Design a protein around this ligand. Sequence first.
Ligand SMILES: COc1ccc(-c2c(C)nc3c(N)cc(Cl)nn23)cc1OC
Length: 462
Amino acid sequence: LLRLFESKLFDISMAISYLYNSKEPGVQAYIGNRLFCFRNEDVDFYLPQLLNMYIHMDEDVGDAIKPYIVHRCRQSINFSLQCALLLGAYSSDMSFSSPVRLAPEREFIKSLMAIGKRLATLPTKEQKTQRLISELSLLNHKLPARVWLPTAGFDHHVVRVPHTQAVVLNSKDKAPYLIYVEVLECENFDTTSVPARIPEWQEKVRRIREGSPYGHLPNWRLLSVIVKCGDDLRQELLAFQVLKQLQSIWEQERVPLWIKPYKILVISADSGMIEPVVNAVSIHQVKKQSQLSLLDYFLQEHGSYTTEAFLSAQRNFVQSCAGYCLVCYLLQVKDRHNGNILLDAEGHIIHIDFGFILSSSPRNLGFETSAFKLTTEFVDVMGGLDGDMFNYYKMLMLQGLIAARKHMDKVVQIVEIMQQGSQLPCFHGSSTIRNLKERFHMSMTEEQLQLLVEQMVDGSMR
Ligand SMILES: COc1ccc(-c2c(C)nc3c(N)cc(Cl)nn23)cc1OC
């Protein structure tokens, strides 16, 4: 990057950029020393990009990043966990500060994933659930301990697992399972000590709490996760990064677009944990259960046409649908079906299963392509092709596309970096980044962008 950054900014994304892109002899180390000057929480986002740069890139870059992580690994234990896991997952084809530091955690995770790997023999989901709880009952024996769910945005200890409420999501061999976990918040996980056991919609929080020994605690907080033992979440993690970025961007420029990136934890190349969305539901399931048109569902659940509940509902619907049309466009998300889109109790829609994105396309699939489509049933919810909020939809898409163009470097950066030494389908040659850049359309005028958006909408409906 041409040295010549002397014309100062200076920004964390851009610093990463100078670290990745720069061929100058002195700058890699410089940035390496400038990372310390940054808000730790800001740096922790690009973490998977640092290690993948650490792993697959030059010794200059390696030795450049190297001191920062050690500074932090000493500083934060969860950070260390992350560094380890990601060091294991992202290299293919290429009582703390003691060695027992992470052992309880390692064994916790190992347990959960083993449990998940044991379900294969049992064909049908119900059997799997029963066996699951039967095996899952055993952890509270060893609990509490020094253990935490990195998913949580707070330091904590896992003191209990309400085993009875565990469920299994599907009948496959690699089929995931959802669990609920009772934890108690600390101020600092490193300083604070381990509490002591007590052996005796989402209101599940309640009915668990009142049914829990540690329930009475003011610290007490419930968490939930999805343990996928046979699945590779690295791609999906990339999706998480991108989504989070676009969220930040759209927040900055004050565009109403609503998307909810859900957290991702990559434990291994075949393993990982996801943080579930609450109160949202499959939208296929709505069609099945309700036996109602999506609109009619909106009219059943929230109010009627003039009811503020309805208006808010479909407004959030529109904004959401828009944000995700844009996301799906840029990121070239595929494999969209009702199974992949949820609907929250507030009336948003939430996409999942990001496994197929960018250059990654599903097999089979003769002559039908699996992509975001605006169903008639959707428009019916919004309005109609001529409808008061449809123009709002399109306008929103336009605005978001603009702001995206503005911040494009930040978004492309993540991907471009994570392309290094990857075995993943999403990366195909230099095609991926190219097509992405061209997907931002920096050469277009907002009128041509309005046109484009007209083409995108028209192209969705068919
Ligand atoms: C198969 O793998 C997955 C299974 C479930 C979810 C997920 C999340 C993060 N939130 C929800 C939710 N609220 C409902 C359902 Cl059914 N799934 N789900 C995401 C997955 O990643 C692809």
